[PDB]
């Protein structure tokens, strides 16, 4: 629902160049501050000043559109003080100390097992590594088998598609259907790990929720749901895009293999160069003017904060994957303001620890030379921008 905005098609466009997405967004930002994306179904805010303002004025740009779907009752759908309260609690699970504990207890072991398992006939690091690792990690946080989560794949994406394409009745309906079909699993996990007294990081989370007097069936389900949507599906694509960036720049890959301390930068520059999400959705709560542009109350819009990822003035030669950029580029993929991804520290860590294992174990790692991946937003019916595959050779050396 928009007005005088140029039509555009920025998201669902395949390209063999992983930079195409970023460039397109940037190119559109230079033509106009707001466009209407016909495939994505809403006005897209592209100018940094509009976006940074919008992240901070939550009463004008709210997350109330999430109150009408499966995320109702979760953190993202909360507003004002209710959100602040609950965010305080979600924050406790992602503190540096907690995140390191997860690294030693789960993510390092699991990443090593996942990687050794590849030493397989025809390796695709998307399905065999980037999807595998986060799924197994969530498996272990729940005390639940990873193969049972793997069968939720199509449901997890159906759930997510209805959170983005909410202008689409069928996507919304399938999102609800899929949640209902996954409620059993989610409730089971909650019951086992809220049990008498047992031991999963999930158990610790549920005991914390109770200690803070926020223990409800909805809250417990929503946390579990978060861990699935973010810590499994969304994290996968961040790992995939980072890998691709390294494979596509073998000098940089070599440097990183020789000095793993370069990994955090490799990941942050990854998020700039080849971002896995677009930003965020927001509901305009009052008629608002943004320079010459007008938006009506009731319009859902997208803040495409990644349109700055290719601003030459901030990141010269934006097409170039340069892990030496300093300061490191600001991570627009996690959103902004009060709703900024609370799981980021876990996600960044899974990527670091997973990649380090991979590069340690296969010095010979390289892309298969003329099977170029294809990139688009909507890859595999997800809500990520990502490759369709990442075929690799693990030797010579
Ligand atoms: C790794 C586990 C993850 C978990 C458990 C998780 C969880 C969450 C939660 C609960 C929120 C809502 C926070 C709030 O409203 O205050 C959130 C927001 C968000 N997360 Fe994640 N997340 C994860 C990973 C990721 C990854 C890898 C990405 C993107 C690459 C991502 C992108 C986002 C974005 C863009 C938002 C903002 C939505 C908004 O501001 O409206 N997250 N995450």
Curated annotation (Swiss-Prot):
Uppermost EC category: oxidoreductase
UniProt key word Aminoacyl-tRNA synthetase: no
Catalyses which reaction(s): testosterone + 2 reduced [2Fe-2S]-[ferredoxin] + O2 + 2 H(+) = 1alpha-hydroxytestosterone + 2 oxidized [2Fe-2S]-[ferredoxin] + H2O; androst-4-ene-3,17-dione + 2 reduced [2Fe-2S]-[ferredoxin] + O2 + 2 H(+) = 1alpha-hydroxyandrost-4-ene-3,17-dione + 2 oxidized [2Fe-2S]-[ferredoxin] + H2O
Keywords assigned by UniProt, alphabetized: Heme, Iron, Metal-binding, Monooxygenase, Oxidoreductase
One of the record's GO molecular function terms: iron ion binding
A Pfam family recorded for this sequence: p450
Entry binding sites for heme b: 83, 87, 282, 336, 339, 341
Keyword Lipid metabolism listed: no
Secretion signal, residue range per the UniProt entry: none
Domain of life: Bacteria
InterPro entries membership: Cyt_P450, Cyt_P450_B, Cyt_P450_CS, Cyt_P450_sf
Cofactors that this protein relies on: heme b
EC number: 1.14.15.19
Biotechnology annotation for this entry: The production of regio- and stereoselectively hydroxylated steroids is of high chemical/pharmaceutical interest. Mutagenesis can change the selectivity of cytochrome P450-mediated steroid hydroxylation, providing the basis for further experiments to engineer the biocatalyst toward novel steroid hydroxylation positions.
Reported function: Hydroxylase that can catalyze the in vitro conversion of the sesquiterpenoid nootkatone, a natural organic compound produced by some plants, to at least five hydrophilic products. The native ferredoxin reductase FdR_B and either Fdx2 or Fdx8 ferredoxins can act as the redox partners for the conversion of nootkatone.
Entry similarity comment: Belongs to the cytochrome P450 family.
Protein name per the record: C-19 steroid 1alpha-hydroxylase
Native organism: Sorangium cellulosum (strain So ce56) (Polyangium cellulosum (strain So ce56))
